[PDB]
Amino acid sequence: VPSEDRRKYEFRKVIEELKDYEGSGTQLVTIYIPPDKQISDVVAHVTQEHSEASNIKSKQTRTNVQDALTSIKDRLRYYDTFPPDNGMVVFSGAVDSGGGRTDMVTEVLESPPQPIESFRYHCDSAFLTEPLAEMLGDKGLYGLIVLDRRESNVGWLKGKRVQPVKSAESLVPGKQRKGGQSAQRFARLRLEAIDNFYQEVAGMADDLFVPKRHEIDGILVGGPSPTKDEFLDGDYLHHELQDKVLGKFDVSYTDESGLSDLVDAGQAALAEADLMDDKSDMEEFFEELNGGKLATYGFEQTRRNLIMGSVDRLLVSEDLREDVVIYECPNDHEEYETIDRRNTSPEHTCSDCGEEATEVDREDAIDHLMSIADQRGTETHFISTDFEKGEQLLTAFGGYAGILRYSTGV
Ligand SMILES: [Zn+2]
């Protein structure tokens, strides 16, 4: 299971490929399989559909549908009892190529950034990738703390889903009678329990957040009134977690559903936290550009530095949509051209000789560069286009850049 940013990029790419496909009728099959849905169960479901497909009126459709389902069965023989992490999505169907000819497409997308929730069987004129294109929305692990005077909830924001894990109660004497010329406050007793309260909440945050150590990207704290302020301002929460707190937010509901409200109210603070590694990468890149050394950009120059193993970090735009087309000249120079994915490979005149170059391969430009980076153990970061320098990586520098450790040549 590769990096999450890398998984997001792979999925968007394949999704675009799958949507380019179309059958002559209703014969493209899509199956979403949650990680807890057993394989023999879905294998059993397709057998049912394969048998039911005998009822299909037109022969051509019947043959195509049954071939697609048969191909699914065959593919699932290479999987164990359960689909991999986060589930699995299967696509299968006889697609329309040219001249009335068909081609069997069978593909499986394993382990989305966000786990598959529900099992779904779909048969259509197009592959069902829309529900998959929505679980590519968020990234990051964030701790959540909501507390009141009565209760407290601690949990996770894993991407876009909220997960309550720990909970607590007041531990102070109860509410009851107001006024009556009486005030049986337990002055010192209450403040001890309140200190003990907030300390156990820190404990909860310690039992939970220290596991995913640096893995968490921030912590949200919610609560109404000075209750949250009192909790945050007074050093109860332990400084080690006070560090990664993104901010305090006004949330007046403190049950398990308050965690979702916290995520809602802190949406702006979250989107900025998401950009932490990106903004630090690009700030470092621009300082090296202005510094005149240790920086590279553009597909050609980035590729060259990658080969030399001189690249500290490969920086590629996550919104990149280019293919690299690989060429061979009769005199043995491997040229390269980048174009948009949906564009036919361009005619290439080969500088160094002027002869017409011959296309011998084509692949995703990032996949191409990233394989080299992996050989040299170079970290590859996918830069969001949301912020200014991240957008400029794409629009000003072509979407390809690299921070060097040793600058040389050129
Ligand atoms: Zn040439």
Swiss-Prot record:
Record-level GO cellular component terms: cytosol; translation release factor complex
Subcellular locations according to the entry: Cytoplasm
Pfam families, per database record: eRF1_1 (PF03463), eRF1_2 (PF03464), eRF1_3 (PF03465)
PANTHER family associated with the record: PEPTIDE CHAIN RELEASE FACTOR SUBUNIT 1
Family: Belongs to the eukaryotic release factor 1 family.
Subunit structure: Heterodimer of two subunits, one of which binds GTP.
Family matches, as HAMAP family: Rel_fact_arch_1
Biological function: Directs the termination of nascent peptide synthesis (translation) in response to the termination codons UAA, UAG and UGA.
Name of this protein: Peptide chain release factor subunit 1
Protein source organism: Halobacterium salinarum (strain ATCC 700922 / JCM 11081 / NRC-1) (Halobacterium halobium)
